[PDB]
Structure formats: structure tokens, C-alpha cells
């Protein structure tokens, strides 16, 4: 009974531990993640000034969006150099018994708090048309909050009881597929009676939404893809997780900021 290796990461980091690559790589990416917010929280303040005041509040729940991201992943860096430490005898780097471990709670904090405001954002850009905007309002933060907090929840059980962990990922996941079929009534009423550039955007804004969301669910599972026997159970299922999620975090906080800044501007021509 390993005691020590809560989640995946550490399993591994204590039984098998991570090649060198793996640690360097896994150590890069969460850095260019928090990277990335920095710069993005110096790009949405500089260009508030590019979007009419009615569409500003977008600009700011983006710049809040930034702070959060960057002050919570560059914690889960930190927390993943810390928690892990080379062992010459085998040539690997091992769970640090003098470390804090491997602490997920960094990044579905992040979510908890940035969903509801990515959600929330796109309010201030398009018109609702047939709906209400509490009603949209009401359900995005509920639904947003269950999703994040069962998906929490699962992830505690992912090495102790597979099965809650996948029935709580399965509730997270009906929660997020109401997200998704409100979003899309959202873009759909949004698009009503604007510019067909403005249309545009809003079509790639659904499948950025979609596509980026989707990689959540993803590197949730990403480890047991493969079987229990198979190939991502391991450091690579570890390397492709925190891959996953960085990308998802930069595409469905930066780039949908981007794209509804953008939004925001062609709507400042008609
Ligand atoms: C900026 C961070 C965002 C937009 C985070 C979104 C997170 C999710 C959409 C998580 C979804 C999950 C499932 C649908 C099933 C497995 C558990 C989660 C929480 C990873
Ligand atoms: C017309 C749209 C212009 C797109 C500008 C995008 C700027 C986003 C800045 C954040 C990404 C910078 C990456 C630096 C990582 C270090
Ligand atoms: C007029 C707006 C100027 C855009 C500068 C973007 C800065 C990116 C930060 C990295
Ligand atoms: C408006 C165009 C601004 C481009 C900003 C490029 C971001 C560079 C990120 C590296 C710092
Ligand atoms: C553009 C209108 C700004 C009103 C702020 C409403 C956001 C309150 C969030 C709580
Ligand atoms: C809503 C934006 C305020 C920042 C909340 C994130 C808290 C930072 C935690 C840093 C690591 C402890
Ligand atoms: C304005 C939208 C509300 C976002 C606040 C963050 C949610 C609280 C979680 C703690
Ligand atoms: C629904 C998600 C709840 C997130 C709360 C976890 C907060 C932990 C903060 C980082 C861990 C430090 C120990
Ligand atoms: C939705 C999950 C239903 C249970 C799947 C069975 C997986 C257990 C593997 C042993
Ligand atoms: C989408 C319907 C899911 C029904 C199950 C609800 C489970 C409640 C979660 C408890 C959180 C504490
Ligand atoms: C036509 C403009 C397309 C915008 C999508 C940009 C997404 C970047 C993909 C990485
Ligand atoms: C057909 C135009 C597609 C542009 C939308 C952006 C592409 C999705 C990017 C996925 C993020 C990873
Ligand atoms: C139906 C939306 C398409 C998104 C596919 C991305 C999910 C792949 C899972 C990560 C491996
Ligand atoms: C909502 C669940 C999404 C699962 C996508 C990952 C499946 C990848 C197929 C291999
Ligand atoms: C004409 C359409 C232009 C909109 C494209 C928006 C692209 C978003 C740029 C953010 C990507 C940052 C990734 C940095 C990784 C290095
Ligand atoms: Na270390």
C-alpha cells in the first residue's frame, strides 16, 4: 500500500518516478502557461481603449481572468519543481517526502473562479435576442460551479477508486455539456442582426469554445486512454495532461478574449 503517491502525478512520482525529459518538460510548460497569462493581462489592459465603453467590462472580466491564471499557475509550477527531486542512485526524479506533493488544487481553483467570468464575459459583447439575461446568467454560474466541483471531487479518487472517479466525471461532464448547449443558444441569438464579419467571428468563437472546453474532459482521462496496462498510463500520460490543460488554459482564456475583443471592435463600424 503506497501511502505517500492522491493523484496520478504523484503515483507515478513515487513508484516509478520521471525520467529527466519528462520532469524538464512537464516543468516548461506549466512556466510558458503562466507565461502567457502575463502577457495576456498586459494585452487586454493595453487594448481596452480599442473597444467601446459598452463592451469595456469584457476587456476588464479578461484582464481579472489574466491575474487570476497567471497567480495560480505559476503556484502550480513552483508546486511541481517542489515536489519532485532528483535520486542519483536511479537517475529519475522522486516524490519529495520534504515537499509539499503534488497539489491539483491550484489549477481547479483557477477554474472555479475563471469560468464564471469567461462565461459571464460574452454577455457584454453579443445581444440576447428571445432569452434573458439572468436566466443565461443564472445557469452558467450554477452549471459552471457543479461541473468545476465535481470534477474535483473525481480527482481525489483517481488512484483509489477509479470508478467514483469516472461517475463523478461523468456528473461533471452533464454539467458541461449544459454549458455547452447554452452557449450555443447564446451564439445563435448573438448573431441575429449583426454584420456578417461579426458573424464571422462568432462562429470561430463556438468552435474555439467547443474545442478548448472539450481538452478538459480530456486530460482528466488522458492517463487511462490506453488501458490500465497500456501506454499513457505513466509519465507520458502525466507529460500529455499537463500539455492538455495548458493549451486548453491559453486557448478557452487568451484566445476567446482575443476573439471577442475583436468581436467587441467591429461592433464599435456598423
Ligand atoms: C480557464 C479554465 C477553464 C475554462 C476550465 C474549464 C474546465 C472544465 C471545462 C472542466 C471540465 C471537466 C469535465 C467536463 C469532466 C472531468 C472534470 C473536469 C472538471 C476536468
Ligand atoms: C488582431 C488580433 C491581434 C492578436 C494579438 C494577440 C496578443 C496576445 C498576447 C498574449 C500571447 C503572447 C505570447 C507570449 C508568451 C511569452
Ligand atoms: C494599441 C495597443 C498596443 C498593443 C500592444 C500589445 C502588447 C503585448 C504585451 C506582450
Ligand atoms: C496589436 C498587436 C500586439 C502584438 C503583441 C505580441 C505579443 C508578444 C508576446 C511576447 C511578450
Ligand atoms: C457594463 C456594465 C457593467 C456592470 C457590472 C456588472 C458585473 C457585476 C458582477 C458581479
Ligand atoms: C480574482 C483575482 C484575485 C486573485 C485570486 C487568486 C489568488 C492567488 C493565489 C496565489 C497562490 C496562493
Ligand atoms: C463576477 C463573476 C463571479 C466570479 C467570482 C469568483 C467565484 C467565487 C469562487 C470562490
Ligand atoms: C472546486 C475546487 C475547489 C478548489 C479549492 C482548493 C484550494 C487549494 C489551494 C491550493 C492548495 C494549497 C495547499
Ligand atoms: C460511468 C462509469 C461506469 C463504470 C465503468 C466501469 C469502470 C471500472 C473499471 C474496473
Ligand atoms: C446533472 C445532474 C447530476 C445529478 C447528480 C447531482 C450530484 C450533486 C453533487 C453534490 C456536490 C456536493
Ligand atoms: C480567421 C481567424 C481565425 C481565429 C482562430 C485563431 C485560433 C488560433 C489557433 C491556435
Ligand atoms: C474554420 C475556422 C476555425 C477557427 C477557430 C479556431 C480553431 C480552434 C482552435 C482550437 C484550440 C486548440
Ligand atoms: C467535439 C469537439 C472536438 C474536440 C476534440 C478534443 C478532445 C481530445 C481529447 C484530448 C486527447
Ligand atoms: C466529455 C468526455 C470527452 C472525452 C474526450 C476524450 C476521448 C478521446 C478519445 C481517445
Ligand atoms: C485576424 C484574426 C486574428 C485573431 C487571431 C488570434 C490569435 C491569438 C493569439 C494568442 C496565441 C498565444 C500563444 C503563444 C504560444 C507561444
Ligand atoms: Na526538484
Same mark, same amino acid.
Given at each position: 500500500?503506497?501511502?505517500?503517491?492522491?493523484?496520478?502525478?504523484?503515483?507515478?512520482?513515487?513508484?516509478?518516478?520521471?525520467?529527466?525529459?519528462?520532469?524538464?518538460?512537464?516543468?516548461?510548460?506549466?512556466?510558458?502557461?503562466?507565461?502567457?497569462?502575463?502577457?495576456?493581462?498586459?494585452?487586454?489592459?493595453?487594448?481596452?481603449?480599442?473597444?467601446?465603453?459598452?463592451?469595456?467590462?469584457?476587456?476588464?472580466?479578461?484582464?481579472?481572468?489574466?491575474?487570476?491564471?497567471?497567480?495560480?499557475?505559476?503556484?502550480?509550477?513552483?508546486?511541481?519543481?517542489?515536489?519532485?527531486?532528483?535520486?542519483?542512485?536511479?537517475?529519475?526524479?522522486?516524490?519529495?517526502?520534504?515537499?509539499?506533493?503534488?497539489? *491539483?488544487?491550484?489549477?481547479? #481553483?483557477? =477554474?472555479?473562479?475563471?469560468?464564471?467570468?469567461?462565461? &459571464?464575459? !460574452? +454577455?457584454? /459583447?453579443?445581444?440576447?435576442?428571445?432569452?434573458?439575461?439572468?436566466?443565461?446568467?443564472?445557469?452558467?454560474?450554477?452549471?459552471?460551479?457543479?461541473?468545476?466541483?465535481?470534477?474535483?471531487?473525481?480527482?481525489?479518487?483517481?488512484?483509489? *477508486?477509479?470508478?467514483?472517479? #469516472?461517475? =463523478?466525471?461523468?456528473?461533471?461532464?452533464?454539467?458541461? &455539456?449544459? !454549458? +455547452?448547449? /447554452?452557449?450555443?443558444?447564446?451564439?445563435?441569438?448573438?448573431?441575429?442582426?449583426?454584420?456578417?464579419?461579426?458573424?464571422?467571428?462568432?462562429?470561430?468563437?463556438?468552435?474555439?469554445?467547443?474545442?478548448?472546453?472539450?481538452?478538459?474532459?480530456?486530460?482528466?482521462?488522458?492517463?487511462?486512454?490506453?488501458?490500465?496496462?497500456?501506454?499513457?498510463?505513466?509519465?507520458?500520460?502525466?507529460?500529455?495532461?499537463?500539455?492538455?490543460?495548458?493549451?486548453?488554459?491559453?486557448?478557452?482564456?487568451?484566445?476567446?478574449?482575443?476573439?471577442?475583443?475583436?468581436?467587441?471592435?467591429?461592433?464599435?463600424?456598423?
Amino acid at each position: 500500500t503506497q501511502e505517500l503517491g492522491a493523484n496520478f502525478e504523484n503515483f507515478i512520482g513515487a513508484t516509478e518516478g520521471f525520467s529527466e525529459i519528462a520532469y524538464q518538460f512537464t516543468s516548461h510548460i506549466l512556466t510558458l502557461g503562466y507565461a502567457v497569462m502575463l502577457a495576456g493581462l498586459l494585452y487586454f489592459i493595453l487594448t481596452i481603449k480599442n473597444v467601446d465603453k459598452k463592451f469595456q467590462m469584457s476587456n476588464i472580466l479578461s484582464a481579472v481572468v489574466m491575474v487570476s491564471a497567471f497567480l495560480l499557475l505559476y503556484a502550480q509550477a513552483q508546486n511541481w519543481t517542489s515536489s519532485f527531486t532528483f535520486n542519483e542512485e536511479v537517475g529519475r526524479y522522486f516524490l519529495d517526502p520534504s515537499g509539499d506533493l503534488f497539489n *491539483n488544487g491550484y489549477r481547479y #481553483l483557477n =477554474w472555479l473562479i475563471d469560468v464564471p467570468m469567461l462565461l &459571464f464575459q !460574452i +454577455l457584454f /459583447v453579443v445581444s440576447l435576442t428571445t432569452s434573458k439575461f439572468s436566466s443565461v446568467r443564472n445557469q452558467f454560474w450554477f452549471s459552471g460551479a457543479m461541473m468545476i466541483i465535481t470534477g474535483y471531487i473525481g480527482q481525489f479518487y483517481e488512484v483509489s *477508486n477509479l470508478t467514483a472517479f #469516472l461517475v =463523478w466525471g461523468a456528473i461533471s461532464s452533464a454539467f458541461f &455539456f449544459h !454549458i +455547452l448547449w /447554452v452557449m450555443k443558444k447564446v451564439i445563435n441569438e448573438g448573431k441575429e442582426g449583426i454584420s456578417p464579419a461579426g458573424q464571422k467571428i462568432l462562429s470561430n468563437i463556438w468552435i474555439l469554445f467547443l474545442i478548448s472546453w472539450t481538452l478538459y474532459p480530456g486530460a482528466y482521462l488522458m492517463p487511462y486512454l490506453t488501458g490500465v496496462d497500456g501506454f499513457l498510463y505513466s509519465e507520458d500520460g502525466v507529460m500529455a495532461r499537463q500539455l492538455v490543460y495548458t493549451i486548453a488554459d491559453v486557448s478557452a482564456k487568451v484566445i476567446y478574449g482575443v476573439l471577442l475583443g475583436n468581436l467587441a471592435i467591429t461592433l464599435s463600424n456598423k
